[PDB]
Design a protein around this ligand. Structure first.
Ligand code: HEM
Length: 110
């Protein structure tokens, strides 16, 4: 099966490399990027991200609910546009299908 866990790991590496300040909103704030895989808060977040991807593909994802939760953290369309680019890179590195359509679904509620 597609290794979404690896894709998500690359996604977070790209995301926080381009926008380090985004990492301050998470429970793994201040943690060195190359050590995130050993951080408990990160493992949980990454797992939830993998879950969301599988839910989007599976057809059970609640894009409206995810958008509202992100608004609840002062995360908006701009951040999601930035994320879209990082995820596109991360998918490509693993021969995985692109996920822009799923981010578009979220953006449609931001
Ligand atoms: C491809 C784009 C993204 C996806 C698929 C995604 C997915 C998720 C998921 C599944 C959760 C958990 C929600 C829950 O538990 O109900 C979450 C939480 C969160 N997301 Fe994202 N996200 C994305 C982009 C971003 C960006 C760009 C930011 C920028 C700051 C961000 C900030 C957060 C924060 C602060 C949380 C809560 C963390 C915590 O509870 O400690 N997200 N995200």
């Amino acid at each position: 099966m597609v290794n979404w866990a690896a894709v998500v790991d690359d996604f977070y590496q790209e995301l926080f490399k381009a926008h380090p300040e985004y990492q301050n909103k998470f429970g793994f704030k201040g943690v060195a990027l190359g050590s995130l895989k050993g951080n408990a808060a990160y493992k949980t977040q990454a797992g939830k991200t993998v879950d969301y991807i599988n839910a989007a593909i599976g057809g059970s994802a609640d894009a409206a609910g995810l958008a509202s939760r992100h608004k609840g953290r002062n995360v908006g369309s701009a951040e999601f546009h930035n994320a879209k680019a990082c995820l596109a890179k991360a998918c490509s590195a693993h021969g995985a299908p692109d996920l822009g359509w799923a981010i578009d679904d979220i953006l449609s509620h931001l």
